[PDB]
Amino acid sequence: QLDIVIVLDGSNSIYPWDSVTAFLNDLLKRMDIGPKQTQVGIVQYGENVTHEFNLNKYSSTEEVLVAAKKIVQRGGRQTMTALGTDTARKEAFTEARGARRGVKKVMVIVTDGESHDNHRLKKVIQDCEDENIQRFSIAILGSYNRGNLSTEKFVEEIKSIASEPTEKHFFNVSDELALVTIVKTLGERIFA
Template structure:
């Protein structure tokens, strides 16, 4: 009983102290420490259906969530959008720099009225909210928390998809959700799973009534602040290990090799490069192979681009199959969990060894293969190197000068493939 009393006392101090102190012991843990480094848009229900009393309860709930997150320059940044007939940004990410200021701003909000247009609210968020000029901090995950009384008045599927593809982690908190008879009146009966980042249950909370919503402060904050599980913040541009396997054979020549390096740099430039985002590695090959730089050597785009430009031309034969094996063993063996493994092979001629076996093994190991052929490259070999469907993973240029024309299509295809992954 004494322990329970202490825990409750500590919880009340944490919730209502302007500057909560985090304790790390085996008995107590302050679950909202100031390591909650996220940028959050709260989408607040402002329709007439919620009523004045429940609207006031909603504001109190949001105030407690904000206090628990520890808002500030070193912690969370929060903003709020009210949705009714049309969405309105009540305050953005750079407006409030402390929990006290944000909580006070929430209490001043007046109910908008109208319908529960969640879809319009999500559209407003992905188009206008997470912009640099609105206070988006860039490296902090973007989160949208939707509080909904019952069910939406409009469609959420498409605006939610666009928001997720922009890297926004959508959470749905539904209060007094529709019963079986009422669900027949909802245009998208499965609107929660159609909206959230993943359909695993982590991104959705079902609250029985507004009288019980205070019990969900802690579960919501724990999830929003869990950066490891904010999977929607992983986009096609910041979630891969990309290995370039570059032909350095004598048929390429010094000047053309410099053109290939520029091609590698142009693709790399499109990605967000850091130790926690996309990482770039490079192998050059002739009959032999060498790692020009591994994934963990350079942690900034500037350093990667500089390293690419300083790769020296090797000169020799063409053993593409051995180079693919080498890249898998020497680069992808050190890939990080949840990273997409992308292999981009650039060659200008026929390989002296077999490429089918090494390519098949790479694909079996989860490596996504892209083949870029130039001049005398063999179509059948490019098809074997590439993942399926080959039409999205094989590219060809008649001469070295034309290779940079396919840069944008390769990046587009990498993103298309990422966005087509199942959400569950």
């Protein structure tokens, strides 16, 4: 059984959002969701954080897909990935929000920018390590490539968020429309 929390960058740079909800749909529909099966919560972050829904809010896959399709982009000029990730760790993965005792914890972090808080990342990721939270991280290079931005540090930061081995837990996605192409591999790895 798996408790999976998706930590979704909602910043304005990500476009179109339909591509993100398509990714969520395609990923989640492959799961058997339920109190004795897989649970999913989703946290959206930008400049702040929102719990879109709790791990124990929904008891079927069909419910989660309907909820997923309805997540709206909250925007943000900046990217508080350390805040989003840390909020997933200490709020989303609590029994109060449906986390199940003794069940494995998996975080899937999806982002298209370097965080403002880079600084607190080392510590947040260390607490995740301490708490055995397996992390998959997905860097979307679309907005950066579209602004002729250097993606080197960006990719390094997101790689650094993923669990080792990096080549299993980190995904470099060129652009938003390409997000749906990783779903099979992402799913296979999460449920290895």
